[PDB]
Structures are given as C-alpha cells and as structure tokens.
C-alpha cells in the first residue's frame, strides 16, 4: 500500500557543483523520496529517507532543509530550499512523519527479539 504523501517542486542544491536547480520530488509513505527533472524518464534522484535527520538552514538560501542520513562509513546529504518557510514546514514535517512511522516498523521488528 505504498502511495505518494507529498510531491512538488523543490530546489535543489547539486551535491557535486553546489549550484541550484528545480527538481520534481515525490515523496512516498514507505521512504521513497524521488526527483525528476520534469514534472512526471528514470529519475535524478532516488533515495530513502528512513533513519533520517532534517535540518534547517538560512544560508546561504532562506527556508532551506537539508536531509541527512547516515549510511555505513558515509554521510548522505540533500539540500534543499523554498520561497516560504511554510512551505519548509510542510515538507519536513511530511518527511518526519514518514520517518517516523518507518522508525515505529524498525522497532517493532528490532525489539526484544
């Protein structure tokens, strides 16, 4: 029963050129969080975010939030920003409620095995 929880478009800080771009993410209720160039081709982006950590930012953009996830030896970082900080609060709270929800499964599997 995997379905979209949020999509739209968000500008993205490259990971390689530290330039900013519009990407099309949606956002799934199992983690899958996905970005096309155009709005809906293979993605530019595909990645979980299970186990993440949203941040907030200023600068160098106003409303950006970074998602930040620890994987093995590497730290995986996304980017992001919009015009408003309620825009911001919108996506990262749908974020951590997905997150959250993921991390209640993670604990009911992992627990007192």
Request: proline share 5%.
């Amino acid at each position: 029963d995997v379905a979209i929880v949020k999509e739209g478009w968000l500008h993205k800080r490259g990971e390689y050129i530290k330039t900013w771009r519009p990407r099309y993410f949606l956002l799934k209720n199992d983690g899958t969080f996905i970005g096309y160039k155009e709005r809906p081709e293979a993605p530019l982006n595909n990645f979980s975010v299970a186990q993440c950590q949203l941040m907030k930012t200023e600068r160098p953009r106003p409303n950006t939030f970074i998602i930040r996830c620890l994987q093995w030896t590497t730290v995986i970082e996304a980017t992001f920003h919009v015009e408003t900080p309620e825009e911001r609060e919108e996506w990262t709270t749908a974020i951590q409620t997905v997150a959250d929800g993921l991390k209640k499964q993670e604990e009911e599997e992992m627990d007192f095995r």
